[PDB]
Amino acid sequence: GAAGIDQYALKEFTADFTQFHIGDTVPAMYLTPEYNIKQWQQRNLPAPDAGSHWTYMGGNYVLITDTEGKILKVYDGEIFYHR
Numbered sequence: 816g817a818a819g820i821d822q823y824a825l826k827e828f829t830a831d832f833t834q835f836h837i838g839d840t841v842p843a844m845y846l847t848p849e850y851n852i853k854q855w856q857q858r859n860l861p862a863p864d865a866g867s868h869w870t871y872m873g874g875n876y877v878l879i880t881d882t883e884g885k886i887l888k889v890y891d892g893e894i895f896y897h898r
């Protein structure tokens with residue numbers, strides 16, 4: 816198996832009474848920097864796309880473009896406790 820981060824890599828979920836997939840868009844409620852985890856290097860998480868940030872959604876970390884908020888990537892929250 817993998818023993819890294821791919822084990823926490825989803826493809827899709829529901830939060831906020833909204834279903835999403837790789838390539839959905841978030842609402843503007845999560846474009847705000849109030850959820851922007853710039854603090855991703857002191858984590859197992861991968862480096863963001865070149866115009867996006869990691870966002871704590873409903874117990875999952877989504878990557879959203881600051882210029883669209885396409886759901887570039889999604890990981891589960893459990894990657895936060897991983898070592």
